[PDB]
Amino acid sequence: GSHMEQRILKFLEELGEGKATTAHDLSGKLGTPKKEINRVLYSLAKKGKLQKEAGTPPLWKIA
Amino acid sequence: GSHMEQRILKFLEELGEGKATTAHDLSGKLGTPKKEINRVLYSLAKKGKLQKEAGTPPLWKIAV
Amino acid sequence: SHMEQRILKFLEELGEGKATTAHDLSGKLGTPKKEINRVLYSLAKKGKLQKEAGTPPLWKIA
Amino acid sequence: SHMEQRILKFLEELGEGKATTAHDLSGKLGTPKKEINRVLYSLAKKGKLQKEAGTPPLWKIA
DNA sequence: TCGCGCGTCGCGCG
DNA sequence: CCGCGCGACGCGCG
């Protein structure tokens, strides 16, 4: 893309370091299906750019 | 309960003025079954403290 | 399950053109109406029961 | 359902007590794996099929 | 230990 | 024309 990766990093940056959010939350606000959201979230995780907090659902933040 | 009633009111107050949220949303940020959250949400509406807006799911905000 | 069996029986002991409500079944088998309704709608899927429109909805055997 | 029938047949031809996987069915029926599992688990709710523990899980006609 | 089926739900109801 | 069955869901999978 060009790029769902950058859009997410912003929503979290604007949210402020140390604050988390769910994929379901990012889905409805970025107008993007939760499916594509998670595959990018986990992609960012494999790049150490994001940190996941286990749970149901999982929480994502910049840290 | 009043404890839960006060927690919900706080959240909406901090959420700014004119903004709304959902029961599913409050459920996660309060660690409480949505079934229970709705009991309190609708009760506060009975007391004229909250207003319910149409939507999917419905949106809730402080009564004006 | 023990519920599906205990509902089918009751409705069978009922007439052919007879139909009852989930509320009547709840206050007859000492069972949460949520459970009764769960089973009823479950049996309606398997064609084992028939639902008649209205409030409350009426239920009978097929 | 037709998809339900194509699966039941395969398992019947496979023998009694025999089991296979979703991946296998997917390839021999030319149907996406997601669709296969939906029907498998669906039939499991109807008591038609039986799921055996494993990875991937094995499926047998109950 | 790639297991994955996964949809919708609005429900407040005593 | 209170009808209401409604649980859990974590899923990213190529």
Query: What is the tally of structural domains in chain D?
Result: 1
Q: Rounded CA gap, B35 and B4, in Å?
A: 13
Please check whether residue D60 is in contact with residue D17, taking contact to mean a CB–CB distance below 8 angstroms. yes
Whether B22 sits with its Cβ under 7 A from any strand E atom: the answer reads yes
Residue B6 is which amino acid? Q
**Both tokens of residue C37?**
């309704």
CATH code for position B5? 1.10.10.10
Which chains neighbour C (Cβ–Cβ under 8 Å, 3 or more pairs)?
A: none
Pair C40, C17: CB distance under 8 Å: no
Q: Which residues of A touch B28 (CB under 8 A)?
A: 22, 57
Can you read off the two tokens belonging to residue A45?
Answer: 């995780």
**Strands in B1-64 per DSSP E:** 50-53, 59-62
Q: Would you state the structure tokens that stand for residue D14, as one six-digit string?
A: 């496979």
**The token pair that represents A42 in the structure block:** 């986990």
Closest chain A residue to the Cα of B28, Cα to Cα: A57
Quote the domain boundaries for residue C49. Answer: 1-62
* One-letter amino acid for residue B46 of the chain: K
Give B-chain residues touching A25 at CB under 8 angstroms. 25
Cβ atoms A37, A27 nearer than 8 A: yes
B54: number of Cβ within 10 Å: 6
Q: Please confirm whether the linkage preceding D57 is cis (ω < 30° from 0).
A: no
The position carrying tokens 């052919």 is: C16
Using CA atoms, how far apart are residues B55 and A36, in angstroms rounded to an integer?
24
Q: Write b or e for each residue in D26-40: b if 16 or more Cβ atoms lie within 10 A of its Cβ, otherwise e.
A: beeeeeeeeebbebb
* Cβ count near B41 (within 10 Å): 20
Instruction: Count the alpha carbons within 13 Å of A23 in the hemisphere toward its beta carbon.
Output: 20
Question: Which residue of B lies nearest to A56 if distances are taken between CA atoms?
Answer: B28
The label of the residue with tokens 């107050």 reads B13
**Contact between the CB of D41 and strand E at under 7 Å:** yes
Contact by Cβ (8 Å): A38, A4: no
- Name the neighbours of D, counting chains with at least 3 Cβ pairs within 8 A: none
Q: What are phi and psi of C57, to 5 degrees?
A: -60, 140
d(CA B28, CA B46): 24
